[PDB]
Each structure stands twice: as structure tokens, then as C-alpha cells.
Design a protein around this motif. Structure first.
Motif, PDB file in Angstrom:
ATOM      1  N   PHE A  13       0.826  -1.203   0.000  1.00  0.00           N
ATOM      2  CA  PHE A  13       0.000   0.000   0.000  1.00  0.00           C
ATOM      3  C   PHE A  13       0.866   1.261   0.000  1.00  0.00           C
ATOM      4  CE2 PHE A  13      -3.337   2.861   0.838  1.00  0.00           C
ATOM      5  CZ  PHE A  13      -3.058   3.609   1.963  1.00  0.00           C
ATOM      6  N   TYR A  14       1.778   1.342   0.959  1.00  0.00           N
ATOM      7  CA  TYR A  14       2.644   2.506   1.089  1.00  0.00           C
ATOM      8  C   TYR A  14       3.605   2.616  -0.093  1.00  0.00           C
ATOM      9  CZ  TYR A  14       0.846   2.937   5.821  1.00  0.00           C
ATOM     10  OH  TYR A  14       0.012   3.082   6.908  1.00  0.00           O
ATOM     11  N   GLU A  15       4.032   1.476  -0.628  1.00  0.00           N
ATOM     12  CA  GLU A  15       4.903   1.463  -1.801  1.00  0.00           C
ATOM     13  C   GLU A  15       4.182   1.988  -3.038  1.00  0.00           C
ATOM     14  OE1 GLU A  15       8.044   1.731  -1.376  1.00  0.00           O
ATOM     15  OE2 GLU A  15       8.679   0.062  -2.645  1.00  0.00           O
ATOM     16  N   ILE A  16       2.896   1.683  -3.153  1.00  0.00           N
ATOM     17  CA  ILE A  16       2.096   2.194  -4.257  1.00  0.00           C
ATOM     18  C   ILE A  16       1.851   3.697  -4.084  1.00  0.00           C
ATOM     19  CG2 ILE A  16      -0.062   2.012  -5.546  1.00  0.00           C
ATOM     20  CD1 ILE A  16      -0.286  -0.874  -4.583  1.00  0.00           C
ATOM     21  N   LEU A  17       1.635   4.127  -2.841  1.00  0.00           N
ATOM     22  CA  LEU A  17       1.519   5.554  -2.536  1.00  0.00           C
ATOM     23  C   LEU A  17       2.855   6.253  -2.768  1.00  0.00           C
ATOM     24  CD1 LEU A  17      -0.587   5.554   0.747  1.00  0.00           C
ATOM     25  CD2 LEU A  17      -1.366   5.792  -1.608  1.00  0.00           C
ATOM     26  N   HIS A  18       3.919   5.478  -2.635  1.00  0.00           N
ATOM     27  CA  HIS A  18       5.283   5.952  -2.830  1.00  0.00           C
ATOM     28  C   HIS A  18       5.550   6.239  -4.312  1.00  0.00           C
ATOM     29  CE1 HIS A  18       9.858   5.056  -2.004  1.00  0.00           C
ATOM     30  NE2 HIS A  18       9.600   6.350  -2.006  1.00  0.00           N
ATOM     31  N   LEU A  19       4.575   5.926  -5.152  1.00  0.00           N
ATOM     32  CA  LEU A  19       4.677   6.167  -6.582  1.00  0.00           C
ATOM     33  C   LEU A  19       3.950   7.460  -6.954  1.00  0.00           C
ATOM     34  CD1 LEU A  19       3.964   2.503  -7.675  1.00  0.00           C
ATOM     35  CD2 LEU A  19       6.183   3.607  -7.373  1.00  0.00           C
ATOM     36  N   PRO A  20       4.706   8.547  -7.184  1.00  0.00           N
ATOM     37  CA  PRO A  20       4.132   9.869  -7.450  1.00  0.00           C
ATOM     38  C   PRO A  20       3.637  10.047  -8.886  1.00  0.00           C
ATOM     39  CG  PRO A  20       6.513  10.008  -7.521  1.00  0.00           C
ATOM     40  CD  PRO A  20       6.183   8.577  -7.185  1.00  0.00           C
ATOM     41  N   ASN A  21       4.237   9.321  -9.820  1.00  0.00           N
ATOM     42  CA  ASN A  21       3.901   9.473 -11.235  1.00  0.00           C
ATOM     43  C   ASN A  21       2.715   8.603 -11.604  1.00  0.00           C
ATOM     44  OD1 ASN A  21       6.328  11.121 -12.580  1.00  0.00           O
ATOM     45  ND2 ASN A  21       7.201   9.705 -11.086  1.00  0.00           N
ATOM     46  N   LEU A  22       2.365   7.696 -10.709  1.00  0.00           N
ATOM     47  CA  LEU A  22       1.219   6.833 -10.906  1.00  0.00           C
ATOM     48  C   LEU A  22      -0.057   7.658 -10.797  1.00  0.00           C
ATOM     49  CD1 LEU A  22       0.815   3.796 -11.421  1.00  0.00           C
ATOM     50  CD2 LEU A  22       0.328   3.565  -8.988  1.00  0.00           C
ATOM     51  N   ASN A  23      -0.878   7.612 -11.841  1.00  0.00           N
ATOM     52  CA  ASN A  23      -2.108   8.397 -11.889  1.00  0.00           C
ATOM     53  C   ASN A  23      -3.028   8.030 -10.729  1.00  0.00           C
ATOM     54  OD1 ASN A  23      -4.083  10.185 -12.831  1.00  0.00           O
ATOM     55  ND2 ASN A  23      -5.034   8.622 -14.119  1.00  0.00           N
ATOM     56  N   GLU A  24      -3.571   9.051 -10.061  1.00  0.00           N
ATOM     57  CA  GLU A  24      -4.313   8.875  -8.809  1.00  0.00           C
ATOM     58  C   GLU A  24      -5.377   7.787  -8.915  1.00  0.00           C
ATOM     59  OE1 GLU A  24      -4.628  12.956  -6.542  1.00  0.00           O
ATOM     60  OE2 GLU A  24      -5.057  13.340  -8.657  1.00  0.00           O
ATOM     61  N   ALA A  29      -7.158   1.552  -8.992  1.00  0.00           N
ATOM     62  CA  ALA A  29      -7.139   0.181  -9.489  1.00  0.00           C
ATOM     63  C   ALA A  29      -6.220  -0.721  -8.670  1.00  0.00           C
ATOM     64  N   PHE A  30      -4.984  -0.286  -8.462  1.00  0.00           N
ATOM     65  CA  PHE A  30      -4.000  -1.107  -7.764  1.00  0.00           C
ATOM     66  C   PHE A  30      -4.352  -1.281  -6.292  1.00  0.00           C
ATOM     67  CE2 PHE A  30      -1.210  -1.949 -11.108  1.00  0.00           C
ATOM     68  CZ  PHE A  30      -0.939  -0.803 -11.828  1.00  0.00           C
ATOM     69  N   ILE A  31      -4.526  -0.175  -5.589  1.00  0.00           N
ATOM     70  CA  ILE A  31      -4.782  -0.218  -4.156  1.00  0.00           C
ATOM     71  C   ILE A  31      -6.177  -0.747  -3.840  1.00  0.00           C
ATOM     72  CG2 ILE A  31      -5.118   1.202  -2.087  1.00  0.00           C
ATOM     73  CD1 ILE A  31      -2.778   2.903  -3.002  1.00  0.00           C
TER      74      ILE A  31
END
Length: 58
Positions: A13-24, A29-31
Motif C-alpha cells: 500500500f505505502y509502496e504504491i503511494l510511494h509512486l508519485p507518477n502513478l495516476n491517482e 485500481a492497484f490499491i
């Protein structure tokens, strides 16, 4: 198995949030995936980081 979200899943979860370029949309979808199926953490991280990298202006 009382809890469904282990430390690994939260880490994902935090690693995905750690992705700034990932569209909100993509991040959340991922989280969606992490939070119906808290199992494919590594898969979701792989895909999310690849997609984040793709969306990351080089």
C-alpha cells in the motif's frame, strides 16, 4: 487468519503511494486490487512501479 492485510500488504500500500507518477485512477485500481485481494502485493507492486515508471517523464 483474523486480519486480511498483513504487514506485507500494508507495505505494498505505502509502496504504491510511494509512486508519485502513478495516476491517482491507477493508484486507487492497484490499491481496489490490494484492498478485494490482499494477496497479489508483489504483482501489484511490479505492475504499479512499471506503470509509474512509464508515466514518469524521463
Amino acid at each position: 487468519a483474523d486480519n486480511k492485510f498483513n504487514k506485507e500488504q500494508q507495505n505494498a500500500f505505502y509502496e504504491i503511494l510511494h509512486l508519485p507518477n502513478l495516476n491517482e485512477x491507477q493508484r486507487n485500481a492497484f490499491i481496489x486490487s490490494l484492498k478485494d485481494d490482499p494477496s497479489q502485493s508483489a504483482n501489484l507492486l511490479a505492475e504499479a512501479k512499471k506503470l509509474n515508471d512509464a508515466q514518469a517523464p524521463k
